[PDB]
Amino acid sequence: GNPLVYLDVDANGKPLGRVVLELKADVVPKTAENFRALCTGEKGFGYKGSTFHRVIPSFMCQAGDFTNHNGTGGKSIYGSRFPDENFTLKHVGPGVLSMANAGPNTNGSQFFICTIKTDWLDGKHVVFGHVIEGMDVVKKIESFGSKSGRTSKKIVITDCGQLS
Numbered sequence: 001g002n003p004l005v006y007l008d009v010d011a012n013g014k015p016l017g018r019v020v021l022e023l024k025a026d027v028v029p030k031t032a033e034n035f036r037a038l039c040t041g042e043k044g045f046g047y048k049g050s051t052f053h054r055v056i057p058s059f060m061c062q063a064g065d066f067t068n069h070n071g072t073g074g075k076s077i078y079g080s081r082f083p084d085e086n087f088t089l090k091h092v093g094p095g096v097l098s099m100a101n102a103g104p105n106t107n108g109s110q111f112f113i114c115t116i117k118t119d120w121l122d123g124k125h126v127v128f129g130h131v132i133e134g135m136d137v138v139k140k141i142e143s144f145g146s147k148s149g150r151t152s153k154k155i156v157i158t159d160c161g162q163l164s
């Protein structure tokens with residue numbers, strides 16, 4: 001079946017717990033596979049040790065820039081960027097996992113977890129999964145954001161990987 005992966009998250013060195021994500025490989029196999037491999041680190045790089053660098057309350061929590069840690073970087077397992085696979089899954093509500101980008105066909109490694117329905121992103125960001133467990137952790141992360149996106153605590157993915 002579809003992969004289950006996890007992110008274990010600290011805030012200022014205090015563990016918040018685990019976010020478990022189901023990746024919709026049946027709908028977006030290429031996008032799901034990229035994220036899965038970045039969680040395991042099996043290509044020699046990935047999310048372990050990186051941060052949630054931009055968090056906006058009542059919107060989303062963004063992470064995945066494991067090279068520049070500021071929204072400019074990241075890379076996929078395929079190359080620096082890869083195309084939008086499809087827009088079949090929609091930004092339906094809290095817990096949606098979707099690709100951050102810099103316009104059409106600029107997927108790398110950055111992603112966001114929604115804390116609300118974000119319908120205006122439909123057709124612009126590739127949705128590829130959703131939170132299975134740990135929305136409480138996501139709400140903690142969200143609470144350390146601000147309108148500007150600046151975080152008020154250092155939010156670190158201390159560990160990540162694949163469960164099944």
Ligand SMILES: Nc1ccc(S(=O)(=O)NC(=O)c2ccccc2)cc1
Nearest residue numbers: 056058059060062099100101112121
């Ligand atoms: N990942 C991601 C996707 C889209 C955008 S955005 O279009 O530049 N800003 C908002 O969508 C928004 C909505 C509510 C409050 C603040 C910002 C930003 C990050």
Ligand SMILES: Nc1ccc(S(=O)(=O)NC(=O)c2ccccc2)cc1
Nearest residue numbers: 071072073100101102103104106124
């Ligand atoms: N790096 C990067 C990240 C996101 C984007 S975007 O979402 O396609 N456009 C804007 O964010 C934006 C905001 C205000 C004015 C003009 C554009 C583009 C590049």
